[PDB]
């Protein structure tokens with residue numbers, strides 16, 4: 001009997017099995033009676049779906065059926081931590097889950113909410129099915145390569161290393177760049193389902209693939225979106241948000257900048273977090 005990496009049997013948990021035969025742990029927040037819409041929540045690198053409890057509960061409050069899974073190599077899902085054969089796996093897997101929920105709740109509009117890496121996944125999912133999603137909520141999505149990490153030198157170095165030693169890694173992120181809310185930083189640091197290990201070279205290449213794929217995908221992207229971004233984000237530079245606003249073809253696009261705020265806007269200072277929740281609430285309400 002298959003168990004999570006934390007040794008809980010999948011038979012005890014909501015789950016699905018992906019096209020690669022890997023078990024992904026699933027999470028649902030269902031309203032009473034008929035939901036108005038579906039929304040998938042797509043987490044970032046190193047994290048898991050459990051970190052979207054509050055957001056998901058608020059959205060369920062609006063009579064949406066919220067669903068999520070932990071990406072392969074994350075959380076309670078199977079796979080070597082923060083490694084993937086190709087970035088598209090993540091997209092393929094989101095689509096499988098979406099397709100399943102649509103089977104079960106047909107005729108309902110479906111939305112995507114993504115943060116960071118999960119934001120890139122959400123963009124690529126929408127690009128793969130033009131015209132299909134009713135909307136996208138992007139919290140500081142991974143949109144461009146960090147300028148010094150993208151130096152053709154290191155990109156060459158990484159590609160070379162990946163064929164000889166892919167399980168070399170770079171530094172753990174400094175967790176204090178995630179949020180000015182030091183309470184939230186502590187929680188990040190003490191969540192056993194978060195992988196805080198350094199970024200593996202083989203994964204970095206896939207993150208570089210994603211950024212490239214997202215940029216190819218922008219001029220063909222038409223889905224309505226709300227984009228939220230902190231001005232002081234050291235992980236996804238605010239410049240990427242302006243690039244997104246400029247390149248997307250979407251007729252319905254809105255950007256909010258949060259002055260001074262870090263990366264994890266939904267776990268930022270209370271004044272930023274309450275704004276985030278409210279804005280998402282309004283934006284999804286008006287489109288359901």
Ligand SMILES: O=C1COc2ccc(C(=O)N3CCC(COc4ccc(F)cc4Cl)CC3)cc2N1
Pocket residue numbers: 044045046047115116117118142144145146149150173178188199204205207208211235236264
């Ligand atoms: O709540 C949380 C918890 O901590 C988090 C940690 C990470 C993310 C996330 O998904 N990020 C940040 C890291 C960057 C790395 O980017 C690169 C690195 C190396 C390279 F060569 C190229 C690139 Cl493009 C990707 C996007 C999000 C959260 N959010």
